[PDB]
Structures are given as C-alpha cells and as structure tokens.
Homo-oligomer: 273 residues x 5
C-alpha cells in the first residue's frame, strides 16, 4: 500500500494488524491519559486558594495545560479507534484509511501550549538570583518552539526517510539540551535562600523534570530502539510508545504541577504544609 510520510503505527496496522490486546491497551492508555488531565484540571482549580495570591498564577497555568492536554489526548483516543478496524476473518485490527491515518503529530503541535507554559510557570514560584526573568522566559520559549517544530517535521519521516527522521531529531535534541541547561540554572537559583522543605521539593522537581521530559525523545525513537526488525518494530512498539507518552504526560504535567503547588504552599507566608 502507498502510505507516504506516515507514522509506523499505520504500517504495522496495514501489514500485520493489531491483536485484541495491542489495540485495546492502546485505546485504554490513551483514555486514562485524557481522564487524568480532566481530573487534574479540577484539582488545580479547586486548590488555587491554598497558596498566596502571588503563587496562584502557577495553579492557573497548570489548569491551562490540563485543558490543552485533555482536548488533545481525547482527540487522539478517538483517532486511534477510527484508524484501526476489526477484520473478522483473521481476528486482528487493520488500518482503516476512511478514519484517516494515525499521526502522533497532534501531540506535537499541542506541546506549543504545554511546553512554554510548563517552563514559564516555575518562574512564578521560585525567585531567580543572577538570571533575568524575561531572559529565561525568552530562552525557554524560543528553544521550546524550535524543539517541537523540528521534532514535528522529523516524525513524519520515521518510516519514509530514516535520515530526515534522525537529523531533525538531532537538531531537536540540541534545543532540548539548551532547555535542560536553563531549567537546571533556574532550579539552583530557586533553591538559594529558601527553607529546606522548599529545597527538597525543587530537588524532586528537577529529577521529575529530567526523567519525564527525556521519555518524549524515547517515544520518538521507540520503533527503532531494538534496531532493524527488532522486538519494538511491531504492535509491542506501538503499545510501548503510547504508554511512554502517557507516563510522560502525567509526570511532566500533573505531578510537576502538584509539586510546584506544594512548593508554593511552603513558600506561602500564611499557610503551612
């Protein structure tokens, strides 16, 4: 079949098809995804007043991210079930092009919301020392955008052109490293001159940030992480990718937001953890 510049899910779906477990699990994990986001939305709204006014923007930005994430993961859940249809004769789900090809690129473009806001929102809780607010913000936002856009281009080629896939991915990785760099600075400066409780949380946030954010390039490479004709170039790889996205999403968005809220509480002059 002629699929063109399509994600590898579609090639698996068109050739081997998906077992009941593979198809159902992918549907389940995406559903959990969007449910978590909408639950998180409620949490962040309902806890706004648990922190000092100055910190409340962080709650608000968490909520903004939840809205984005809910909408996208919901759409993507529908896209999954529309794109693959049961074949009675062999008892697997095969690519149903009338539903459109499945594309992960939905996620990517919504990151244009999530990434800028997630990076931004910490700057409403921590105080910088030697770094300027506007400067950090601008670096986050520029490098965030470039990371996403370059990766977005890349993922169209993950089957059709491995070279473009890897080159765009590499360029994206550079901007990622920049972001990691800046966020580390921010965390360090954030730690300076605050309670030990606050410092503990910021340590945790950094570990969370580092692991969760690194999962995303993991998902990018997922089909090829066991090399050519490897275990993961398969329905098992498809499952793994969406699992990793979902874990990353919950970690990088919800848990991150929760930790920041807890930080805000310790820093809050009225309130006590």
């Amino acid at each position: 079949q002629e699929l063109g510049n399509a994600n590898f899910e579609n090639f698996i779906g068109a050739t081997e098809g998906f077992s009941e477990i593979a198809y159902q699990f992918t549907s389940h994990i995406l559903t959990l995804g969007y449910a978590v986001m909408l639950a998180g939305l409620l949490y962040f709204i309902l806890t706004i007043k648990n922190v000092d006014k100055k910190f409340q923007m962080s709650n608000i930005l968490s909520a903004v991210v939840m809205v984005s994430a809910f909408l996208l993961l919901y759409a993507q859940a529908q896209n999954w079930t529309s794109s693959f249809t049961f074949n009675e004769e062999v008892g697997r789900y095969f690519l149903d092009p009338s539903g459109d090809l499945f594309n992960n690129g939905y996620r990517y473009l919504n990151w244009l919301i999530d990434v800028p806001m997630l990076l931004f929102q910490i700057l409403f809780v921590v105080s910088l020392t030697t770094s300027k607010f506007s400067s950090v913000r601008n670096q986050f936002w520029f490098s965030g955008a470039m990371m996403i856009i370059t990766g977005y281009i890349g993922q169209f080629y993950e089957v059709s052109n491995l070279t473009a896939f890897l080159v765009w991915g590499a360029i994206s990785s550079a901007f990622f490293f920049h972001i990691l760099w800046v966020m580390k600075k921010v965390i360090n400066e954030g730690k300076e001159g605050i309670s030990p409780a606050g410092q503990k949380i910021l340590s945790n946030i950094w570990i969370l940030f580092l692991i969760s954010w690194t999962l995303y390039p993991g998902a990018y490479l997922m089909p090829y992480l066991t090399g050519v004709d490897g275990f993961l170039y398969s329905e098992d790889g498809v499952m793994a990718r969406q699992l990793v996205y979902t874990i990353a999403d919950v970690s990088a968005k919800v848990i991150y937001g929760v930790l920041l809220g807890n930080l805000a509480i310790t820093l809050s002059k009225n309130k006590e953890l």
Copy 2:
C-alpha cells in the same frame, strides 16, 4: 469467528446474541452509572465548604474520582451500543466488530486513578495513631497499582486461557488482601479519640468498603461463578457483571465519599450534622 484474547461478552454476542432485555438493560445500567458519577461530581464540589478547611481535600479527591468515573462509564456505555447490533431476522443483538470488541479493560486502567485516590482521601479525615501517613499512602498506592495491573492482564484471558486468567487473578487477590489489611488498621486508628457518632460512620465505611471492593473480583469471576456452561455463562452473566460493576462503582466511589464527608462534618469544629 476468531476473537482471540477477548472478553466473554463478545463470545455470547457472537454466538447466541443478546435479547432485547439483556442488551437494553446493560445499556441502561451503564447509563445510570455515568449519570450518577456526574451528579456526584456536582454534589462534592457544592458541599466543599460544609467542612473545615483541613477536610476539604477529601471533597476534592471525591470530585477527581467522579471525573474519572464519569468519563470512563460514558465511554463504556457508548462501547456497549457500538459493539452489538440488532439482527432483524431473529430479533437479537449480535457482535458488530466494526464497533470494536467490547472490553472491560477500560475500567481497569482508570482504576489507576480511582483506587489510589479513594484510599488516599480517608487519610485526610481520620488521624492515625500508630501508623505514618506517608507509609500507609505508599502501601495503598503500590499494592493498588499491582492489584490493578495484574488483574488487567488477567481479564484478557478470561476465555482464551483460563489458567492465566486464574493465576493473574490470584496474584491480584494477594495485593487486594494487603489493601484490606491496611484499610482496617486505618479505620481502627481513625476511630481512636473521636466522638461515638464518628466511630459509627467509620464502622459503616468499613462495611461499605469491604463489600463494594469485593464486588470487583466478583465481576472478574462472574461468567464462571456457576461453573462451566453454567447459568451465568450467558447473556444473564453479562447483565450481572455490569450490574455488579455499577453497584460497586456507586458504593465504592459516591456513597463512600458521602460517608467521609459526613465524618468530616462531625469532626469539624464549626459545623454540625
């Protein structure tokens, strides 16, 4: 028909089909399900301020659970009606694979929200005596996760491999027993040093918890509870399973949350029941 690792609903639906009553009732009970959850959401939000600030997190976590439950039960209600279609010639509803196979696994993965939050939220109402908050929380969350994941794997095999079904089920049961153990401790410690009215509510909560939570493994086993080719391996079993889920869901989520709210009110220094 090759169905593979599919839930037993699909085998009944593919062979015998479902009578009007069986199909309609399952649709009705799932609809009631999600209606209750959204109504509950409203209740828990609207009553937040009926308790002291310190107890309000319990309301919030109830609401979180309601969102999860609403979304899932709604999706599942749609899945039911999509998966089975009326045959004019015999006047029964048969498996329509273009709708996808029906799978209960949707529930399971959403429990990754519900179970942790339901277990967590009592720790915001009762005071422990012997036990550490963080320790109880961690036990709940670890054992909760393992219970769910192992059961999730199990249920894919409920027809295709009875042995895997029962072994995974047994492993899951172990973690369940752990949770029951810990929750009993929590309830006992909770009773210490509160009014007799509060103690009565906690007694009720324990009975509610024990019965409602045990329904879930009941639903797991449902098709086989009357043995091979028994009464329940049938449309009647399909009905029973979804009824039991719905009773469990209402009991374990809504009523539980209401009782905790009532407990919080008695414990509240301002307020009176």
Copy 3:
C-alpha cells in the same frame, strides 16, 4: 418482524411508521425535555445563596436531579432519532433497527437517582414533628426503589405479555401508594409551626406532587388507555406518552424544586418573597 420484549413505539414504527408530525413532535418534546433540565441545573446552582445555609442542601439535590435528568433525556432524544428513519417512497419514518430498538427503560433506571433525591430533599426544608427523619428517608428510598424496579420489568412486556405488564404494574402501584401516604404525612408535619404563606406553598407542592407523579403510571398505560385497537395504540399514543413524560418531568423535578426553594426563602431568617 421479530421484536420480542420491546416497547410499543417499535411496533407502530415497524408496521405503520410515523408521519412527519408524529416523528418531529416526539423529537421536539424530548429536546425541550433535556433543555429544561440543563436550564434548571443553572437556576438551582445560581440561587443556592438565596436561602439560609441549612436549606441549601435542597438546592444542591435539585441540581443533582437536573444532571441525571439532562443526561438521560439527551440520550433518549438521540435514541428516538436513531431508531426511526425516513422512507422516501411512502414519506413516513419506520423502525431502523441499526439504531437499536427504542426503549423507555432508560428513564426508569435513572429514576433510581431522581425519585430518592426528590423525596429526600423536602426533608431539608420542612421540619418533621412526630416522624423520624431517618425513618421517612428509609421508607421513601425502599418503596421508591421497589416501585421503579418492578415497573422497569413490567414495561418490557407492554406488548409481548400484557399479563406480566399489568401484574408488575400493579405491584409497582402498591409501592407508589405507600410513597403518596408518607409524603402526605411529611407535608402535614411540614405545615406545623410555619407561616400561612409557607403552608400555602406546601399545599401547592402536594397538589403538584400528586398530579405530576401520577402522570408516570399514565405514560406506562398510555397505549392501552383507549383499550384494544384504540385511538392511542398508534403514533398518536406514542406522541402522548412522551408529552406526558416531559410534562411530568418538568413538573416533578423543576417546578417542585422551585417551589421548595420558595418555601426555603419564606422559612429563611434573612429573606422575604
């Protein structure tokens, strides 16, 4: 055609079909139904603070009922339009079984929310005298449940087995009479020790309650109220049934809730009508 234990709408729809007016009107009246409920939801939430704190639970329970009613009536409106399809050749709408058979049983199982809550909520506005709150509540809830469940079973047989239809209906009626009995007691005790204005409202509530609630068994019997092959065993009967449900729903849920709110205002120490 083999329909089995199906509602009479399906038999009319399968044989004669529905004229433009009959089909469209039924669609319109169901749409009005769910619109009223969602409007009511907004009303009850937005007026919570118009009454003293102690009365506010009544507003909350009204809102809970509105959510249930909205969801159900919306679903049912969709069910109507899915179940009957235009035939170009004769210019009528006929049963389209790909949409599923139409069933009123959706309503019934949702009453498991509405009835308990509607009966419960008056006990938050009026004070009982000689009767115990818990006792009245338990009577309402038990008899409510039995009324609904028995009727639910009944209505499956309204065509397939007139005898079961009438017997189950009769049993249901018994529990109905019990509820009427208890509600009268409650209204009487409610009147004791309140202003004449409050007493007037409770008088109206009783009339509303009695008429609106009696419409429901009216809708049950509707097809047969002009006897065999009567005027009402027809599209005209179909229209009448859904009209009666909608009038009943608006009366028993929204207007009831409004009157209770007005009562609460007169009883409120701050406020005046």
Copy 4:
C-alpha cells in the same frame, strides 16, 4: 416523493437543491446563532454581581434562556447539515432524508422556555404601579403558551395546507398582540419613579422588543412574503428565514438581557454605569 406536512426548506432541497452559498450561509448563520448564546451565557453569569441582589434574578433568567437557546440552535445547526447532502453531478445540496427532514418546529417548542422567561425577567427589574405582578405574569405566560402552540401547529402546514397555515398563524397573532399590549403597560409603569437614564433604557428595550419579536411572524411567513412563485419561495427565502431567526434570537434574548442588566445597574444603590 411525498414529504407530507414538512417545512418548505425540504421542498426546495428536494427539487432545485441549494447552491454552495445558500447551503453554507444557512450553516454559518445557525453556527453564529448558538455561539452567540453560549458566549451570552458566560456574560450573564460573570456579570451577576454587577447589580444589587434584588436584580440578580434577571441575570439568572437571562442565563437560563441562553442555555435553552444554545442547546436548540446547536441541535438545529446539526439538523441543517444532516438534512442536505452534496450531489457531485450537478454541484448542489439536495434533501437527504436519511438525516430526517428539516423542521423549524425545534425552535417553537423551546420558546416555551424562552418566551415565558424573557417576559418574566423584566418584572425583577422594574416596579409595577397600577398592574399586579401575578396578573401580568399570568397573562404573559398564558398568551405566550397559546401564541407558541398555535404557531407550532401552523408551521407544519406551511406547504401542505396554506389555509391551516394562515388560520393558525392568525390565531397566534392575536395572542402576540395581547403580549405586546401587556409589555407596553409594563414598560410605562417601569419608567415611573426612576432616573431619566433608566427611562431611556426602557424606551430602547421597548423598541428592541417590538422589532425583534415581530421578526418571528416575519420568519413564519417568509416563503410567501413575495406571494406565489415569488423570489422568496426559493433558496433565497430559506437563507432569509434563518437570518431573520438569528437576528431575532440575538436581539430578543442577548441584547434584551444586556439592556435589562444595564437598567438594573442604574437602579442599583451602589453602582454607577
């Protein structure tokens, strides 16, 4: 092809079909319709506290109307696009009966909400002098109901029976004139004993009311306003009808509500404008 007692849109759609512009515009104007209503809902909720407590019921009733209007206009927008389908061969949209016939009667029955509430809500801003509240309310509500119901019957016959169409329309018109009568009285009495600023607003409200409400019988007659085989008995008439409804809806519901809110502000003891 017998359409029976169907609206004239269906006859145009079945014979000539709709050009791109006609079909698209009708879709656009209905979409604008429901967008306006949901935006208005938000406005009326968010501005509740801009007026004194006694006036706030007017905001609440505006919101109620917005909910009704949103739901209905949304449904009707979907009905439009479902009822007419592109024919590739001639490049026009023709009646697609699988979507159901299009019927304006959806609007009519929802007016049973809107009209009573719109008429009612002014009585929470203005003070009557010589007229009794209950009497005005009762006249509005009775005549409102009769106006709508008689018109609703009428519009089913707009093609199938011109005589019934016009007679029912005439009867409806009588009740309309009654409403105009009463509302004029109310406006006049409302003016008595308030600031000249308030009096100006009430003058505007009356003009708005008179024009916007008269558009509705305009839309009723629309196909025939250029007589038999006239310019308007055509896709141009179809466009015009839905445009006029939408203008009327925005004027009679949203702008009306805004003006009443502004009146409430001038009458408000704290607030200025």
Copy 5:
C-alpha cells in the same frame, strides 16, 4: 467536477489531493487553534479578580471571545476531516463531498462576535480624552460589520470569480483602514495620563493589533500571493492559510487579551505585577 462558488481548498482536494503532511498538519493546526481558545477561556475567567472592578469587563469580554473562537475552530477542525478522505490507491486525501465542501466562511460570520468585542473591550481599560466612548464604539462596530460582511461575500468567489473576489476584498479593506485609524487614536488617547509601564504595553498592543489583524487579509489572498499557478496555489497554500489564521487568532484574541489584562493591572490602584 462542478464545485461552483467554493473555496480553493476544495479544488486542490478534488484535483491533486492532499499529501499526508498537508492533510495532517491542517488538522493539527486547527486542533491547536481551538485548544488554545478553551485554555484562554479558563485563563481569563481565573484572572478576573487580578484587576480593579472597573477593568473586569475586559476579562469578561476576552472570555466571551474565547467561547466564540473555541466553538468555531472546533467546528472547523471537524469540517476539515469530514471534507477530505484518504484514497488507498494513490495515498492522498481527496475531496469527499458527502462531508460537505470546506468553507472558511464559518470564521467570517463568527468574527461578527469577535471583532466588535475585541475592539470594544479596550474601551474598558483605557480612558479616552478628546474622543467620545459611544462614537468610537459605533465606528468600530459599523466598520467591523461592513469589513466582515463584504469579505464574507468576497471569499465565495475566490476561485469562481476573481474579479468579485478582489473588488469585495478592496471594499472590505477600506473599512479595515478606518478601524486601524480609530484604534490608533484610541491607543494614543489611552497613553495620555498613565505610567510609562502602561504606555509601553499600549505600544505593544498597537504593534500586535496591526500585525495580527493584517494577517487576516493575508489569509484571504493567500492562494494568489505567488500569482497564477504559483507555489501557494497548492496544498502548501492550503497549509499556509490555516497556519496564518491560527497565528492571527492566537495573537489577535488571546495575546491581545493578556496584554490588556496586564495594562489593567498597572492601572489598578491596589495591584502590582
């Protein structure tokens, strides 16, 4: 085939079809669009209380615009995916007329909300000096309406009649220039008698306004900006148009609203950023 007065997307879709990237990207960018608007809705509501009462109407109007924009962009996202369907044989997406033709005119008519409200809302933050509030408002609203309506007519002809396209576009442009004129006045008068911080924001608002609003006529002309049979009369032009709309929408609605909120904060007598 015969498409008539249809947008150029349909001609590309009917002849060449859309590559995976073109089709998917357009779907993604529209999805981002509506996600941003709903996230923005949350932001504007949640930040209402960050400014003095007098400024809060600006927040409210931002929210109103977000509702409009969300609804429209959501609808349009669905319209995109319905209008173009994958062809397995050639591996491109082609016009699927059963989904309706794609039309950008949905946007235009919703601008009847957005434009008036966006222009209006600044008049609640800045103080005019020499210009009258009512006069500015009326000019904005009249010229806004005429700009939109004339452009709306124009865009139907973008393929079918280039002359009408350009003439209507030109007329529209005239009203655009009027709006630019008035807004400049408003911004200048706004700057008078406020802090330099406020003045800086208003400078930014003007640049934002000028660029973002000019994108809209850019999108209008997009297919022809590289002349006949140019690079942009192609799927690449289709992509570009929807990208430009989305950038414009985010800039002119969300960012604009954010800046106005920031202005309101500086002008606010309590508050500090």
